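Hi F.,

I've been meaning to write this up properly since the lab meeting, where we talked about keeping a consistent format for the predictions we share between groups. The idea is simple: the sequence comes first, exactly as it goes in, then the structure tokens exactly as they come out, then a line or two of notes. No screenshots and no reformatting. I'm using this chain as the first example so we have something concrete to point to.
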Amino acid sequence: EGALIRFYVEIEELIYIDVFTTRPDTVFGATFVVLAPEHPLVPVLACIGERLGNACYSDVENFVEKMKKMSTRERTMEEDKEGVFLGVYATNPANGEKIPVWSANYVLYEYGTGAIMCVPAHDQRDWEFAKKYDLPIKVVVKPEGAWDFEKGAYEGKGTLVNSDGFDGLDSETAKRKITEWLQDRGLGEKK
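Output, unedited:
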């Protein structure tokens, strides 16, 4: 089992999004955050988004409503990636960059915290979503062989790049040391 990682939302009130991942080694590659449609923070962040003129609250409420009637088999296996921008950004705890918060069909409320960090370079499901919505691919687990990230996500083991002081470390070793690093900063937790 992996780790819990904390993403503070860049707004006036103190709100954070805990995310469960089996790949804490890829945290520097997180380019956006996705909440399940049923996730209690979706309407909350959406309203904040709108007041800042960054989202349409009714439009988000329409997404949630439509997605509640739909079924698991249809949501993540039959229907193409569908999602809405919430109008807010969260802070990647590893690098401190702001990343956009979205809600999407393919993330189920049942698994983990019902909220995920998205690493398109290294998770195919996230790759498809980023392809549809033009969200960035950021390689952090470089494979040894040649790989075209413009054609697909690489989900295997490798050596860290674009990852601050964790560069050059092998990815399975990096999981522990990045977790321990975040845990010591109160921004992550071992599971």
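Notes:
The CA atoms of residues 122 and 155 lie 5 Å apart.
Strands lie at 3-9, 16-21, 32-35, 83-91, 98-104, 115-118, 141-142, 159-160, 188-190.

If this format works for you, I'll send the rest the same way.

G.
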